[PDB]
Design a protein around this ligand. Structure first.
Ligand SMILES: Cc1cn([C@H]2C[C@H](N=[N+]=[N-])[C@@H](COP(=O)(O)OP(=O)(O)OP(=O)(O)O)O2)c(=O)[nH]c1=O
Ligand SMILES: [Ca+2]
Lengths: 554, 412
DNA sequence: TACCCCCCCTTCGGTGCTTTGCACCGAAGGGGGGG
């Protein structure tokens, strides 16, 4: 054979052998387009006829190239992949257009037959053995071993990406001012060269890629804006996503909502303020992907205003490494947040959204910190720096939160933006007991078998209560006992519990909860003017903690 | 041209496969430049995706350094070489190091580049440099010499090191020298001026053996333990005695002599929290005897070299931080408190980073080990910012805890 | 009826402390997107 470029050694998982599985009953319609290009491979040295000395077999099929009449070949290696050695992918992420610095001229060129231009490893080739079908079952069909990277293997992408870099390395060193965004075979090349010199250098690189036997087809090649790159339309000074089609179905299934949600998550990167909360509330705990489910009046409202954002076209800008990065966040309610990252006011680099609900009980400050960290990670990926933050929280609101919180927390350089709704702490536990406020010693208990329990309290002024509780747990009664003391107390109240569980939940100042009992405690705490929570150990003969421990066990 | 010591992983164990986390621009620049010159000097050489192993890499500046320093996160590799640097080629610990009035840390990590590495082990040192916005896929490398920050590196070089030291260990007999990875700890009872001179002598004594030193000054005798303390009040409220009894109740798991009966008696009624309670004779006495037991040492606490060290840290607010180092629960080998660290009253993460570094340094001097940390922080908060404030050439093991202060045990 | 990468949103099951309840998290299958 012949030898284009430096190969990569491959192995199997030690003490294991190759792929012996029988072919799929493929329809003769695909077989026509199949054996056509298949026989053309052997001429170029891409595939080879093998003797039965090769005892391996792997299935094969083909799917049409999207937006093309051409067909693309795929070999099912699922069983070969299970027994093939592990790699470490060199694809660490995806480039974003909002990271592109502005370039005077830009060229985008695909590599024709990308995997097939890279030589496989000599000794490993035997394991690619597969057989080609026929119109009848009489003729057997030739068995072949790949001499290059097959579409469908688990090592094909990683080896291609790494080989491509070694090829582009000498050129990149000769042309330091050329920006080559290398993603698989898709190449974005840009420069500040004048368009005449730029295309000249493009040809040197097409020659340099050709010197290693890498094709640069003209049809894939694009010389004029707006470039189609990574599903975007790149214009000289602006960019946008390629248009987004929302399904028009009258009756929705589960696979319909999924397609809708994903399309919206994709749109949320530039179209500001996309919300997925109420559409995703429909997919919780559903069995069938095919099941039909109705649209709530909430999710119907959400899809309408999400279509109105998509109605008017939007666009992003490019990165100016000289000017600062700015990220401003707004609160959308129900644990939903959106953000815009920009440099010049009102010209966005990109947008996004953080709606993750982390934990059973949370508040708006916790969720804002989680969103700031999501943006910081996202921003260090794309621009390698942390943006300056414009946050809808008062400076003294934050200063109070992080100083008092028992866990370490922080936010980078930021300034207050007065855009409502503002983030606030809806209540504040006193650091010291309240003089003149009634003091409530609460307690609760449940029977592990009966699921029946009591929750009540005693006070210094003689007040009392006990409540029977049905199908409850020791935790719920300890929370319930506090709910009572909040209901039956004045605007200022001291509450003494022996529950570690409840005091932990309340001291973190939540404004939202999955538990409905907690929301009612939250609701009461906002109403109060001064609340003081305290803790004593149980069964120590302490205070009224012993007296109410007696009432609720009876 | 030196003989390569063979290294094998722990029995039945695979090399480190750890993803590379995003890096800032200034750190990627510093790394590419550090990695370029290290390649033309043959210390490293590029590799390919056939290598299934990877280790994260980033850059730091030491305290006041101003010059970038490369740092690799070998915690996953070190956990899988554990047989090597403990059982086989390990170092004895000089228990007298903690007793010296001054100790200086020097970065000798540049000498590990002298010795080559076992060829079969270079497959586990793979690390990847990321690219801003994924302009380029990951550029991979691996180490041809002893890597800076691997725990097998100081053990292999130990033979070469003790020879380089021997003339100066003889020229100055009573000066203590300990080596923990990329750092060399040297301590004397000499005065500050005499001490810093013998360091420069040790620097030149290292120069003629082919090593530079891009010094940290400790004072192990100075460090002070933190004890559990009871408040002083001329009048006690119900909440005061309730808080007090809860604290003593918690402290009874360490000092068993703690008694609560006469103070619990004072609470017997159902009273308002702010109401004043005069102390009885036996309560005043039970309080007195309790204050004395907390002066004592914990009975039966001692260090076990076979066991791992644990380090808990609690944020006390207004710049204060507390910490306790233990092996078994409630058997505390040391307790302490830090205050007015860098970043106080403005940045929590920086202080917490500064605290981990100080605590780890103390454990290295005292026991020659790095403890596993229980950190009061959320995982996402810490994993984001911690590299920005890290100034040390080692990286301890840590986990994250959420333990609200039901009782303020370690600080009033 | 293939492979590799990134993202969100949901379930589920393992883990440890708040304890045999509840809360957290990470793996995984749904989708979108790139080649
Ligand atoms: C779209 C697609 C691409 N790939 C890989 C394999 C392909 N390499 N090859 N041969 C690369 C690039 O595919 P592609 O760039 O889309 O087209 P290609 O096969 O390289 O031939 P061309 O039309 O003349 O340009 O991505 C895949 O494995 N499965 C897919 O569905
Ligand atoms: Ca192609």
């Amino acid at each position: 054979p012949i030898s284009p470029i430096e190969t990569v050694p491959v192995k199997l998982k030690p003490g294991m052998d190759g792929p012996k599985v029988k072919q799929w009953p493929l329809t003769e319609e695909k077989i026509k387009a199949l054996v056509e290009i298949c026989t053309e491979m052997e001429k170029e040295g891409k595939i080879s006829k093998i003797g039965p000395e090769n005892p391996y077999n792997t299935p094969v099929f083909a799917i049409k190239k999207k937006d093309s009449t051409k067909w693309r070949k795929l070999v099912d290696f699922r069983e070969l992949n299970k027994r093939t050695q592990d790699f470490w992918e060199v694809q660490l992420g995806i480039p974003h257009p909002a990271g592109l610095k502005k370039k005077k001229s830009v060229t985008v060129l695909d590599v024709g037959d990308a995997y097939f231009s890279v030589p496989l490893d000599e000794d490993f080739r035997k394991y690619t053995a597969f057989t080609i079908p026929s119109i009848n079952n009489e003729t057997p069909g030739i068995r072949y071993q790949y001499n290059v990277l097959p579409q469908g293997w688990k090592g094909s992408p990683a080896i291609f990406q790494s080989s491509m870099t070694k090829i582009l390395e000498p050129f990149k060193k000769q042309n330091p001012d050329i920006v080559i965004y290398q993603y698989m075979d898709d190449l974005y090349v840009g420069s500040d060269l004048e368009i005449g010199q730029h295309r000249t250098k493009i040809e040197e690189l097409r020659q340099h890629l050709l010197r290693w036997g890498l094709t640069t087809p003209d049809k894939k090649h694009q010389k004029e804006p707006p470039f189609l790159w990574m599903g975007y339309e790149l214009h000289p000074d602006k960019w946008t996503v390629q248009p987004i089609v929302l399904p028009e179905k009258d009756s929705w299934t589960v696979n319909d909502i999924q397609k809708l949600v994903g399309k919206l998550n994709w749109a949320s990167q530039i179209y500001p303020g996309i919300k997925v909360r109420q559409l995703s509330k429909l997919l919780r705990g559903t069995k069938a992907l095919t099941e039909v489910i109705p649209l709530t009046e909430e999710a119907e409202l959400e899809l309408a205003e999400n279509r109105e954002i998509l109605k008017e076209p939007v666009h992003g800008v490019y990165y100016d490494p000289s000017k600062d990065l700015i990220a401003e966040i707004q609160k959308q309610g129900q644990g939903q947040w959106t953000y815009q990252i920009y440099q010049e006011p009102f010209k966005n680099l990109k947008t996004g959204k953080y709606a993750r609900m982390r934990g059973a009980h949370t508040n708006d400050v916790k969720q804002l910190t989680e969103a700031v960290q999501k943006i910081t990670t996202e921003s260090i990926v794309i621009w390698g720096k942390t943006p300056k933050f414009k946050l809808p929280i008062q400076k003294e609101t934050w200063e109070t939160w992080w100083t008092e919180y028992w866990q370490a927390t922080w936010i980078p350089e930021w300034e207050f933006v007065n855009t409502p709704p503002l983030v606030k702490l809806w209540y504040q536990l006193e650091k010291e007991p309240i003089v003149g406020a009634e003091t409530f010693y609460v307690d609760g208990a449940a029977n592990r078998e009966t699921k029946l329990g009591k929750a009540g309290y005693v006070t210094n002024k003689g007040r009392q209560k006990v409540v029977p509780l049905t199908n409850t747990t020791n935790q719920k009664t300890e929370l319930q006992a506090i709910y009572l003391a909040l209901q039956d107390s004045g605007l200022e109240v001291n509450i003494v519990t022996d529950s570690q569980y409840a005091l932990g939940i309340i001291q973190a100042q939540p404004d939202k909860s999955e538990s409905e009992l907690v929301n009612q405690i939250i609701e009461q705490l906002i109403k109060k003017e001064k609340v003081y929570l305290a803790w004593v150990p149980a069964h120590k003969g302490i205070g009224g903690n012993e007296q109410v421990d007696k009432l609720v066990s009876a | 041209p030196i003989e390569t010591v063979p290294v094998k992983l722990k029995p039945g164990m695979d090399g480190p496969k750890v993803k590379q986390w995003p890096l800032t621009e200034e750190k990627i620049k510093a790394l590419v430049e550090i990695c370029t010159e290290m390649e033309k000097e043959g210390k490293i050489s590029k590799i390919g995706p056939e290598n299934p192993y990877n280790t994260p890499v980033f850059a730091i500046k030491k305290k006041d350094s101003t010059k970038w320093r490369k740092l690799v996160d070998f915690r996953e590799l070190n956990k899988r070489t554990q047989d090597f640097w403990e059982v086989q080629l390990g170092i004895p610990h000089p228990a007298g190091l903690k007793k010296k009035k001054s100790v200086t840390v020097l970065d000798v990590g540049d000498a590990y580049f002298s010795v080559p590495l076992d060829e079969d082990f270079r497959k586990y040192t793979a690390f990847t440099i990321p690219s801003i916005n994924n302009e380029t896929p990951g550029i991979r490398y691996q180490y041809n010499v002893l890597p800076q920050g691997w725990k097998g590196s100081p053990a292999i070089f130990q033979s070469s090191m003790t020879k380089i030291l021997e003339p100066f260990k003889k020229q100055n007999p009573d000066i203590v020298i300990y080596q923990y990875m990329d750092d060399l700890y040297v301590g004397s009872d000499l005065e500050i001026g005499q001490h810093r001179t013998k360091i420069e002598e040790l620097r030149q004594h290292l120069l003629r053996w082919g090593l530079t030193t891009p010094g940290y000054e400790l004072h192990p005798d100075k460090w002070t333990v933190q004890p559990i303390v009871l408040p002083e009040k001329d009048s006690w409220t119900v909440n005061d005695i309730q808080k007090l009894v809860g604290k003593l109740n918690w402290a009874s798991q360490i000092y068993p002599g703690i008694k609560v009966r006469q103070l619990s008696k004072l609470l017997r009624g159902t009273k308002a929290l702010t109401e004043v309670i005069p102390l009885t004779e036996e309560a005043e006495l039970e309080l007195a005897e309790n204050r004395e037991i907390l002066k004592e040492p914990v009975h039966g606490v001692y260090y076990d070299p076979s066991k791992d060290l644990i380090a808990e840290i609690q944020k006390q607010g207004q710049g204060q931080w507390t910490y306790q180092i233990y092996q078994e629960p409630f058997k505390n080998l040391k307790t302490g408190k830090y205050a007015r660290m860098r970043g106080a009253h403005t940045n929590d993460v920086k202080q917490l980073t500064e605290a981990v570094q100080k605590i780890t340094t103390e454990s290295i001097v005292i026991w020659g080990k790095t403890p596993k940390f229980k950190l009061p922080i959320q995982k996402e908060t810490w994993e984001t910012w911690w590299t920005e404030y890290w100034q040390a050439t080692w990286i301890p093991e840590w986990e994250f805890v959420n333990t609200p202060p039901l009782v303020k045990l370690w600080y009033q």
